[PDB]
C-alpha cells in the first residue's frame, strides 16, 4: 500500500531528524498529502525549504521505485507551501518594480524549478521586464532583465 509505505519510511526518517516529528498522510487519488507536525518545524523546513525538499525528494524517489510513476507526493509543514508560493509572487512583482526603475538586472535567490516557472509565468507578459534562468544545480535562479 502506497499510504502505509510512506507512514513507515517517512515516519522513520522523521524520527532521525526529530523524535517529536509526527506524520499524517492523506490520499487524494494521485496526490499524497504528507503533513509534518511536532518538534522543531523550523529546522525541518530548513533554509529556504531545502531540508523539506530534500526529505520530500528522497521520499519521492523511493516511492516511485516501489509504486511506479503514477503517485505524486506533496510534503508540507506549518503551511509552508502556501507562504512560500505567496512569497515567490511577492518577490517577482517587487523585482519587476526594482528592475524597471534602476535599469539593472536583479538576480533572484536560488529556488527550485517549480518556483522558477511561477516567476516566469507571473512576469511572462510584463511590458517592462523579461526573465531568464541562469546558474546550475542549487545555484540556478531567475534573473529579471529590463526590456
Residue stretches of the annotated binding site for CMP: 116, 133, 140
Count CB neighbours of 16 within 10 A.
8
Contacts of 113 (CB under 8 A, 6+ apart): 140
Kindly state the smallest distance separating residue 130's Cβ from a second copy, in Å. Answer: 17
Minimum CB distance to a second copy smaller for 8 or for 104 = 8
The DSSP output letter for 139 is G
Which residues are near a second copy by CB under 8 A? 8-9, 12-13, 15-17, 43, 46-47, 50-51, 54-55, 57-58, 61-62, 65, 112-113, 116-117, 133, 136-137, 140
Minimum CB distance to a second copy smaller for 120 or for 146 = 120
Count CB neighbours of 63 within 10 A.
19
Instruction: Tell me the three cell numbers of residue 96.
Output: 519587476
Amino acid at each position: 500500500d502506497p499510504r502505509a509505505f510512506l507512514e513507515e519510511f517517512l515516519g522513520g526518517l522523521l524520527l532521525l531528524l526529530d523524535p517529536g516529528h509526527r506524520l499524517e498522510v492523506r490520499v487524494e487519488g494521485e496526490t499524497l498529502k504528507a503533513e509534518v507536525k511536532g518538534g522543531d518545524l523550523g529546522r525541518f523546513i530548513g533554509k529556504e525549504g531545502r531540508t523539506l525538499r530534500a526529505v520530500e525528494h528522497l521520499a519521492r524517489v523511493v516511492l516511485a521505485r516501489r509504486f511506479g510513476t503514477g503517485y505524486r507526493l506533496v510534503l508540507d509543514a506549518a503551511g509552508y507551501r502556501s507562504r512560500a508560493e505567496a512569497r515567490i509572487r511577492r518577490l517577482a512583482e517587487e523585482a519587476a518594480l526594482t528592475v524597471a526603475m534602476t535599469g539593472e538586472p536583479l538576480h533572484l535567490p536560488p529556488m527550485p524549478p517549480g518556483e522558477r516557472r511561477i516567476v516566469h509565468m507571473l512576469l511572462k507578459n510584463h511590458p517592462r521586464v523579461t526573465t531568464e534562468s541562469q546558474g546550475e544545480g542549487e545555484e540556478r535562479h531567475v534573473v529579471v532583465y529590463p526590456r
